[model samples]
Structure formats: structure tokens, C-alpha cells
Target: HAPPTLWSRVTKFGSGWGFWVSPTVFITTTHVVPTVKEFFGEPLSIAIHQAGEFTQFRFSKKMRPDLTGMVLEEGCEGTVCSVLIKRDSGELLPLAVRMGAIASMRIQGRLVHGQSGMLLLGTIPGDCGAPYVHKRGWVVCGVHAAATKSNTVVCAVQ
Candidate 1:
């Protein structure tokens, strides 16, 4: 029996990371969409790896500010997980983190309520929208939202 690694499911969305939810739809965060539009503009480019080849695709438009439909995860506290990050060279990697509490936190001057976030270690800029995958089954459980300086604290889309 062979279990699949999730590396193939990860993609570069805007300046961050996103993953395939359907064959055609990819999920990321609101922060990524608007920042890309402001700085880079549409049609946006996203790259994916299949087998061993990296190919890029361009989309027709950018996502509206409120258009990102996301599902919050529950009951994942204290679990082992990893956040998928895409390197500039088109390689995907994971940062291991332990899920922390669900609490309202002010990250980068923005407030994330307890209902919208869970805790983890920090990640760098451009790591937003990366998938927080559960270690057991490699299931995507959360999305990277924002993090505090030097990776001290992070607010994830739970």
C-alpha cells in the first residue's frame, strides 16, 4: 500500500501558498488576494508541480476582498501539524508546528477573534495562505493567516 505525500497538492497562490480543493478551485486567504492585486495585479500566476515538472498557469482575475470562502477547523488543538510553504524556486516545504489554543489575538495590529483562529509558531512574510496540514493523514486542516514578528506567535485560519 502506498500513501501519497501532499506536496503535489500545494501551489503558489499570489505571494503565498494555496492548495487544490477541487480540480479547478484553489483556496487561500484574503490577505494574499488583495496584496497581490495591489502590488502585482491580475491575471495572477500560480505554479504547480506534477510528477517532477513545474508548470505555471495564469488566471483571468483576482479574488474579491470578501470572496474567499474558507472553513474553520475545530478539535485540532494540541495536535501535530505542518504548514506548507512554497519556495521561490518552485519547491514546496513544510514547517512542523504544534497546534495551540483558540484565542483572540492581535497580529500585526489586526485582531483575529477566537472563532477565526488557532495558535502556532510564527512564519515569515509570503507564507500566508499556506495549508496547515494534519500530520496523521496529511489532511489540510487550516490556512496560514498571519504571524507575529520573528515567528513568536501565529494566527491561523482555523
Candidate 2:
């Protein structure tokens, strides 16, 4: 039997992941916004297909600080987790990624307090905004912000 998990709570928006927080409200990374700037202000705007191929969603126009708006699962060294994103084969899956420390890092050009040192072998392109899910409950703990020069995923712990 499949393990009961919140993995299915994650959805695909354009090329990134958008985890639904409420019936109509979903939270994505601040950086994910700029990628869709071209489609700004359309009635049936914000193309959120692929995961559910013909699905549609709109913009709320509300945002929080990069370090805010997620469940704080302060990940220290050796914290095992995973990040969800779609592959080139059109499969939305979680790849193994671990968390490191509670340090301040620059994400999207802003110094923010969040969990840094997320280590992973190879991340998918456009994996930004992917949910950092805690293995224990399979619940999202943070959002994938950016990659460091060393190629580590900058964990934006909320």
C-alpha cells in the first residue's frame, strides 16, 4: 500500500512547483514570479498546467518576505528531506535532498534568514519553488530558492 503522505499536495505551475496552502491559496517562491512576468494581468492568467494538464489558476498579488510564510521545520545538519519537481519525462516526483544549517544566505538578491546548506546531487532546471518536504510526515518544510555558486540548493526555510 502507498504511504499516506502530503506529497500529492504539491502541484506544478509553469516549470516550478506550487504547493497549495488552502483551497484557493497556494504559496510559491518569490523568484518564481519573475518567470511569469510576461503573462501578467490576464483574466485567466498564470498558467498552472502539466500536473493536471488543462488546469488553470490566477494570481493573488500577495506575497510575504522570502524568509516567511511556511511551516518552520528548522533543519539542522543531517536532516533528511526531498524536493518535488517535474522531470523532463513529465513526471512530478520528489528527489532526495538534505538540509544543513540555520544560517543567513542571500536568496534572489536579498539577505534572508533561512536554512542553508541543502545538499543534492543533481537538481532539475526550474526546480526553484520546489517544496522541501520533511521525510517524517512528508510535509513541506521550506521552498527551494536558488543554487549557491557551489551548486547547493539555498533552502528558504519558512
Candidate 3:
């Protein structure tokens, strides 16, 4: 598809990052939303936007402290999405892409399980909850998330 007029489905987690789909619903790590007991209640809200969150979030198993879900009360406005890489020097390299698989890696010492989820190479310190879009057509991947600390959907929830 020809690049749309403007980017939609774009969202931000406290201006830290952007999203692909209308973060009307989102998926982030536990550390991103830190909670009292770690549950999926979409329990937090700021001024204009909000998303469902939960640490201890596990697709199966236990002891997982991460959040993932959607926003119910309010919703998102960003209808389109974009892919850009942010360098440590604060440089941005926009990419032309789409629906790729999450490259969850393995980290030792810190997270025991698969805490590393996909890599969004080059992002900076304030780019969380950002989603990547592919030209394949309206395809987005979000989950409870990453900067690789600055380069991955790799949000650290600990």
C-alpha cells in the first residue's frame, strides 16, 4: 500500500514511546506499570490516555511480573502506525516495514523466563508502548513491552 497521508494508531506511554494500533488497548511489562499485587485491571490512568496493565502476567505458568491488556474506560486516537529507529545519540532512522514477529530474546541473572520480547533496535529512553507496523496491511503487535531499554519492545518490569 502507498504510505497513507498521516500516521494513525500511534500512541505514547507518557511520551516515552508510540503505539501501532489505537492503544485503546495495550500490552506492557510489569515494570512499566508497577503494581501492588500485579493484576490485569487496566488499573492506572493519567490525563488523556490509559491502558490495561498487569505484572505477574503469564500466558501460562507463574511468577511472571508483566502487564498486558486493553483500555476500556477511554481509548486511543492514533489510527495509523509508523516504524522508526532511535539511536543513542537521539538520532531517528525511520524504516519502511510491517507485521514482523516479536524477537523475544533470553536474558540471564535478571529475568528467569523469556523476558526479552522482540527488538525495536535504536529507540531511546522515552519510547515505550510503541508498536511497529508493516505494509502487509493493518498489522500490529503489542504486548505487555521494551526499549531493549532503548532498542527493543523490551520494557523492563522489575
Candidate 4:
């Protein structure tokens, strides 16, 4: 009999809350993926591990806030997913205008609040843009669009 190949692995890093699932992929809160990615660079491969599911995804050329049919906070109002790129001179540049919405739901497994991990779903965030960090400042993978009585939704680039 042949040994079974593992499709996934888990790792840890300082300064972030979740487990790194692959060399270029990780699982963290929808809110934190962007921040961590900034420090790690755009994940060549990305996946969000939600309860009873592992939704695979990838990153776009850049980040932008292009969410529609959702609400935004006052002053922070916008419908675009934003990406931040860091320069050698310590400057962060915003790039691209991501469109569409990323699907998300409350994980129904062992995920606890503040535990720090990714949530999987049936769809990708937006088109193929995975939320990630560029150079270590906090960034959002997608916008917090809405919350159902039972779950929350994020607007990822499509």
C-alpha cells in the first residue's frame, strides 16, 4: 500500500493569529489576511480554511475596494477592495480596483473568536483576488459587507 499524500500542512508565525497552511498560503481571520500578506508578499497560492471546508483561491494583480450592494462605514464609505504595496523607501502604494464580492460565512467548527484562522466557503473571494498583505501594515482581504443573523459576509475582489 502506498502512503497517503497530505493535501495540506500547518505552520505558525509570530505577529499574526492563524496557521500557515502552505508556503504561500495561510488561514486567518478574513479581517487579518491582508495585514499578514503585506508582511509575507502576495501568496502564490491561497486558501481559506473554514469549518468543514477548505475554499481555494488566488490573488489578483493588485488590490482595490470594489464592493457593491453592500454598506460601508461613514467616511470609510467605498465599494472597492484596496491593496497596499510597500516601496523600499517605506511608502505604501494603493493599487487596482477590485470588483464583485467574496463569499464568507461563520465557521461552524472548532474556530474560536481570536483564534486566528481562515474560513472556507463554496466560492472565491472575488474573481481570483485573495486578500493579502504587501509590506506589513494592516489591510483587509475584503470589506465587511454584511452580517446575517447567523453569519458574516465579506466583499472580495472578483
Q: Which candidate should be chosen as best, given TM-score against the real structure?
A: 2
Write down the lDDT that model 4 would get.
0.28
lDDT per residue as tens, model 2, 1-158: 11323545565555566665434335566545434344324434443432101122434553212222334344437777777665556665666766777677665466555565546555655776676766443355666667766546765654
Scored by CA lDDT, what does every candidate get? Answer: 0.51, 0.54, 0.34, 0.28
Worst 10 residues of 3 by lDDT: 70-79
**TM-score attained by model 4:** 0.21
| Candidate with more favorable, higher lDDT: 3 or 4 | 3
Q: Show model 3 residue runs off by greater than 4 Å.
A: 1-8, 18-24, 28-30, 34-93, 96-121, 143-158
Please give the lDDT score at residue 139 for candidate 3.
Answer: 45
**Candidate 3, 1-158: lDDT as tens digits:** 42332133333333344333322333333334432432333333312222223222222222122322322221112223344333335555454322233233444323411223333235444545444443332444342244333322333322
lDDT of 4 by residue, 1-158 (tens): 10111111111223213322223333333433342443345554433444212222333432222211112111112233333222334333334432333333444442222111222222222211223221222223332222223322333221
| lDDT for position 38 in model 4 | 37
Poorest lDDT segment (10 consecutive residues) of candidate 1: 48-57
> Candidate 1's residue-wise lDDT over 84-128, tens digit each?
777777755667767777666655555543223334434677876
Select the stronger candidate by TM-score from 3 and 4: 3
Model 2 has an lDDT value of 0.54
Tell me the number of clashing residue pairs for each predicted model: 2, 0, 37, 23
**Global CA lDDT of candidate 3, please?**
0.34
Off by over 4 Å in 2: 1-5, 22-25, 34-76, 118-121, 149-151
